[PDB]
Amino acid sequence: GDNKPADDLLNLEGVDRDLAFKLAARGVCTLEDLAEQGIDDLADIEGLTDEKAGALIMAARNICWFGDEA
Questions:
Q1: Angle at 36 between CA 34 and CA 38, to 5 degrees
Q2: Quick one: which of 5, 7, 30, 56 has the fewest CB in 10 Å?
Q3: 61: closest CA among 34, 40, 42, 41?
Q4: Radius of gyration (Cα) for the chain, nearest Å?
Q5: Cβ–Cβ under 8 Å, residues 9 and 24
Q6: How many domains does the chain have?
Q7: Domain presence at residue 70
């Protein structure tokens, strides 16, 4: 993952240091970039489930979109 994931992605619960590289190597170098991904888009990832992808992507969206407020 030359792109390297942002600390938000690495420190985001649900994403291990490895998935961070698996996500950063896919163009998502920041947690916000993950909020733009879809369960079907991350479905190709390895170790990610359809329900987990909905939460992982929602975890970044909640922090990137709703933010700490929610």
A1: 85
A2: 7
A3: 34
A4: 11
A5: yes
A6: 1
A7: no
